[PDB]
Design a protein around this nucleic acid. Structure first.
Ligand SMILES: [Mg+2]
Ligand SMILES: [Mg+2]
Ligand SMILES: [Mg+2]
Ligand SMILES: [Mg+2]
Ligand SMILES: [Mg+2]
Ligand SMILES: [Mg+2]
Ligand SMILES: [Mg+2]
Ligand SMILES: [Mg+2]
Ligand SMILES: [Mg+2]
Ligand SMILES: [Mg+2]
Ligand SMILES: [Mg+2]
Ligand SMILES: [Mg+2]
Ligand SMILES: [Mg+2]
Ligand SMILES: [Mg+2]
Ligand SMILES: [Mg+2]
Ligand SMILES: [Mg+2]
Ligand SMILES: [Mg+2]
Ligand SMILES: [Mg+2]
Ligand SMILES: [Mg+2]
Ligand SMILES: [Mg+2]
Ligand SMILES: [Mg+2]
Ligand SMILES: [Mg+2]
Ligand SMILES: [Mg+2]
Ligand SMILES: [Mg+2]
Lengths: 261, 181, 138, 113, 39
RNA sequence: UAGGAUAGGGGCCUACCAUGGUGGUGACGGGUGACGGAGAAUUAGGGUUCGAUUCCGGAGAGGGAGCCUGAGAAACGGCUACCACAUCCAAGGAAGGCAGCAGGCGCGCAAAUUACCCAAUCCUGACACGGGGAGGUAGUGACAAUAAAUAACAAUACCGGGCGCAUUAGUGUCUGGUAAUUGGAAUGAGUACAAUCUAAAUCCCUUAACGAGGAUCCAUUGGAGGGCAAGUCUGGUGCCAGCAGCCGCGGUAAUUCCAGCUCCAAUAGCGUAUAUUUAAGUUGUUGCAGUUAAAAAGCUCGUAGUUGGACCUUGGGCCGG
């Protein structure tokens, strides 16, 4: 190709969008933004698909041009805007607030939060280093660059960021013994506790994690995102508290729930 | 061009040996006893049965405590019981392999309409079902190969708009009344 | 006997590769001389009738097998095609378009007709079957 | 006797309306016209104006005596004019239509000045 | 190349009957079923 | 090695220097009727064959070559030049690129309308609003695929067998039926008010009223010696015409041709040609053969290749379920 591609064909769209294969030839093609477009959830799907607030393409545009939807504290009128993990979507007109979090099956879910727990987010640091005139600054994994961080915050750690003041308010030091929610691979959605980290010089670091219900698993460093200090997490969990289960467990769940109805 | 992505499949397969008397007579026995229209109706039942038997044989090949064997065996047994294809206490997954095409043929809405009264015949039952004359729960079904489940076997009855269980008479019953008047 | 070593995969695979050429079907399909044949890897071909000849049958039989020599439009080759039915040769006229197919047996002569592996199936855009069964005329 | 029975029904203040699935039952009838559906719906939802009501995508289930479709009740005429496509309003009688002819629709206008 | 069509031309012409149409479909299978092992 | 060039690494290119680099583990060359992959067909298992085509990647816009603009092009619905071809001319000149959509010619065995629309999906622009032969809608469409009509029920009848008397009969059972026998009931194929569908229409699904007596609302394609299911029936022809995948038939008594009747198989489908898979343990790794059926080199040596004898504690116990 002689340049950038602007269409996303529906069969090539991410599998966790759950777009149906006969519903057209194209998919929304998330615009560039603070998330990598293969791990984001555009606003078209948040409004039209999940929340069923709109029935068509153009209805979503009619919603956005009216400045209702607010993403992480600012009003975003772009229709394919790449909202992502741990963002907040707010509709003040309905006074309703959602944190984007994973479910155990690896798909984004809009977990309702309160207005208290919507003025802040958590963000993992990509790196820390100096800038022009010796000023230190840190990178997040969603584009944000903060200058003059606490000189302790190192790479791969977590920070709490108030949306009002837009500065840090606390942080978690990435290390063994903290709760972490996996954001990639087959284990995405599963929360757990860091039990082991094994280094490998020249390759990816691997993390070994143990769920609260005992199930043990592992991932690589880039796919782990600490939530809280100690066993208690700092943010709300969705319908399942990040606990993966076998297919037989949910078969039992359906049939056992089929006797009360 | 979307709509090229819609799947479709084959439901039956012709016999390897065209003209063998033994198979010919065995097949005609069923095509007559159950009032089927042609050999294709028998062959699609055979093909569905062969599918479910390959699944059962594969699961039987594995070892128990294999969660695939467990999960798929429970699902397959539930599917067989749901259509009355398997008696009670038979949930051993070896009794699926013993299952016969006569059992599938026994569940078609034609055979069940005949067996419930309502029909006086196996061919009367078919022509009765293809004339909007029979409903299952609340819906007018006119496909003789409907394959009722055991739960909905009670609610089968005539249509609310067929003369035989419903309301107004037919073309000829009115036509004779008008020429009579 | 057969090589059986664990590290003998090259020997077995190269041996099968060499020996498959000894098989007439493999060699027939993998040597390329089918593109030199009249039809050039085609099921059917159209032609112009050049003349009507008539050929005897082999020894155990006795008859005249009535065939038309055709020239293929696509490549200009000259072949003989049997005209299958009783009296269908009288439908064939001189210099009329004709659709020819194979005889069966995939390029090998059929039955008692010597050296003929083609059959006439259409004339003037109309089937020999419909002309022999009176369904359509030309 | 026809009945009306709406499901999956939710009021949104973003587009200032309420959406629902109509599941009209009409034993003995062929089907319910959308105008009569409009009227009947007005008197379960008391709209003061039967022009902000829209119905579409009706199916008429096999075997008869049942129809489903989608229903929109607005709260303004203004909202119905901004939040509804033109052809739908034309169907409800609030607008008018035009046509096209593509030669010189732009082609020879390209080339004069 | 003279006798092409000979026997086809010799034979008497005869015309078919107007026999009754036989049942089609399931009805044909009914007739076969009760003709093979009911009679 | 040092430069030059590039967005940047690099013989990418220049100068100088060294003599290397690949190759029986197949280099280099040739064929490909060869874009690669995801995948497709057949598949007991192992396999065999295919993959132009809607998703991903690449490449091209008649053939080469060079460029400008721009973040991004060696762009072709941009330019410049040549080669091939070709168009308008007022004879000086001018303009070209459908392997986009539709359509035409040619090539052929081989492939649809010069239609409607942005309403869905999405892209795009200054843009909520314009545009979109992308894409959708309809049309042609037995490529493939699904469901599923062409009749059901009653008594009559010349009758026809088991089962009631079974003796000696006689009829009566599930009706099995030549029965254009008699009798109503049922229904959608078709037609069509209406509503619904739809961007507007259309088709479907609902539906008023019409619409079934069996000559019609009429089922075909192949067969009837064997393989292989179904005639030692009747006319014709006489080694002719013809059939026949193979074996074979036909020369005056044709189970095989030409026809009629009858019967057989599949059935809204079935036949034929070609390619391919299976059958094929007739390509054999699983898994074939080599005295005589095809097949041990005349004999030995020998490098790579393949193959390679035995031997060095987890042995004697505790421990928890
Ligand atoms: Mg492109
Ligand atoms: Mg976009
Ligand atoms: Mg061979
Ligand atoms: Mg350099
Ligand atoms: Mg090529
Ligand atoms: Mg090609
Ligand atoms: Mg492509
Ligand atoms: Mg290009
Ligand atoms: Mg060209
Ligand atoms: Mg170019
Ligand atoms: Mg072009
Ligand atoms: Mg074209
Ligand atoms: Mg026939
Ligand atoms: Mg014949
Ligand atoms: Mg035979
Ligand atoms: Mg036989
Ligand atoms: Mg043949
Ligand atoms: Mg012989
Ligand atoms: Mg024969
Ligand atoms: Mg005959
Ligand atoms: Mg052999
Ligand atoms: Mg010898
Ligand atoms: Mg020998
Ligand atoms: Mg050696």
């Amino acid at each position: 190709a002689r340049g950038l591609k602007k269409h996303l064909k529906r069969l090539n769209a991410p599998s966790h969008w759950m777009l149906d294969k006969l519903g057209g030839a194209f998919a929304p093609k998330p615009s560039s933004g603070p998330h990598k477009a293969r791990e984001c959830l555009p606003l078209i799907l948040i409004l039209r698909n999940r929340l069923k607030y709109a029935l068509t393409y153009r209805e979503v545009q009619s919603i956005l041009m009216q400045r209702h939807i607010m993403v992480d504290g600012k009003v975003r009128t772009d229709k394919t805007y790449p909202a992502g993990f741990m963002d907040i979507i707010s509709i003040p007109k309905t006074g309703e607030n959602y944190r984007l979090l994973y479910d155990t099956k690896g798909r984004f879910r809009l977990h309702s939060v309160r207005d208290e727990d919507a003025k802040f987010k958590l963000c993992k640091v990509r790196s820390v280093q100096f800038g022009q005139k010796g000023i230190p600054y840190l990178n997040t994994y969603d584009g944000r660059t903060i200058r003059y961080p606490d000189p302790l915050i190192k790479a791969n750690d977590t920070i709490k960021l108030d949306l009002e003041t837009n500065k840090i308010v606390d942080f978690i030091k990435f290390d063994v013994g903290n709760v972490v929610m996996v954001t990639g691979g087959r284990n995405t959605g599963r929360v757990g506790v860091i039990k082991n980290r094994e280094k490998h010089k020249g390759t990816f670091e691997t993390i070994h994690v143990e769920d609260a219900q005992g199930h043990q698993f592992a991932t690589r460093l880039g796919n782990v995102f600490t939530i809280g200090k100690g066993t208690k997490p700092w943010v709300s969990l969705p319908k399942g508290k990040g606990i993966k289960l076998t297919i037989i467990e949910e078969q039992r769940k359906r049939d056992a729930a089929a006797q009360a109805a | 061009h979307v709509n090229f992505y819609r799947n479709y499949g084959k439901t039956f397969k012709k016999p390897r040996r065209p003209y063998e008397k033994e198979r010919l007579d065995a097949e005609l026995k069923l095509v007559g006893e159950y009032g089927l229209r042609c050999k294709r109706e028998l062959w699609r039942v055979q093909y569905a049965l062969s599918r479910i038997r390959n699944a059962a044989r594969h699961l039987l090949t594995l070892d128990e405590k294999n969660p695939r064997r467990i999960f798929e065996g429970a699902a397959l047994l539930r599917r067989m019981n749901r259509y009355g294809l398997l008696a009670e206490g038979q949930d051993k997954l070896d009794y699926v392999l013993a299952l016969t095409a006569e059992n599938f043929l026994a569940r078609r809405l034609q055979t069940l309409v005949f067996k419930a009264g309502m029909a006086k015949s196996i061919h009367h039952a078919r022509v009765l079902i293809r004339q909007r004359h029979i409903r299952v729960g609340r819906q007018i079904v006119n496909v003789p190969s409907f394959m009722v489940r055991v739960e909905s076997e009670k609610h089968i009855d005539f249509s609310l708009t067929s003369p035989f269980g419903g309301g107004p008479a037919g073309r000829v019953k009115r036509k004779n009344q008008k020429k009579a008047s | 006997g057969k090589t059986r070593g664990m590290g003998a995969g090259r020997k077995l695979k190269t041996h099968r590769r060499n020996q498959r050429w000894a098989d007439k079907a493999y060699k027939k399909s993998h040597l390329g001389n089918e593109w030199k044949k009249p039809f050039a890897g085609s099921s059917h071909a159209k032609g112009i009738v050049l003349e009507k000849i008539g050929i005897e049958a082999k020894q155990p039989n006795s008859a005249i097998r009535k065939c038309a020599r055709v020239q293929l439009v696509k490549n200009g080759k000259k072949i003989a095609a049997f005209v299958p039915n009783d009296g269908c040769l009288n439908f064939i006229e001189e210099n009329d378009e004709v659709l020819i197919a194979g005889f069966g047996r995939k390029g090998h002569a059929v039955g008692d007709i010597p050296g003929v592996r083609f059959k006439v199936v259409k004339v003037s855009g109309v089937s020999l079957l419909a002309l022999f069964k009176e369904k359509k005329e030309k | 006797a026809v009945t009306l029975r709406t499901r999956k029904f939710m009021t949104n203040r973003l587009l200032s309306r309420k959406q629902f699935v109509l599941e009209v039952i009409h034993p003995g009838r062929a089907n319910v016209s959308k105008a009569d559906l409009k009227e009947r719906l007005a008197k379960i939802y008391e709209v003061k104006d039967s022009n902000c009501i829209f119905v579409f995508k009706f199916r008429t289930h096999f075997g008869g005596g049942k129809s489903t479709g989608f229903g929109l009740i607005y709260d303004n005429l203004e909202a119905a004019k901004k939040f509804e496509p033109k052809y739908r309003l034309i169907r409800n009688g609030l607008a008018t239509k035009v046509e096209k002819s593509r030669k010189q629709i732009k082609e020879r206008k390209n080339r004069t000045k | 190349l003279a006798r092409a069509g000979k026997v086809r031309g010799q034979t008497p012409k005869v015309a078919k009957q107007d026999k009754k149409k036989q049942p089609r479909g399931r009805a044909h299978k009914r007739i076969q079923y009760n003709r093979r092992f009911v009679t």
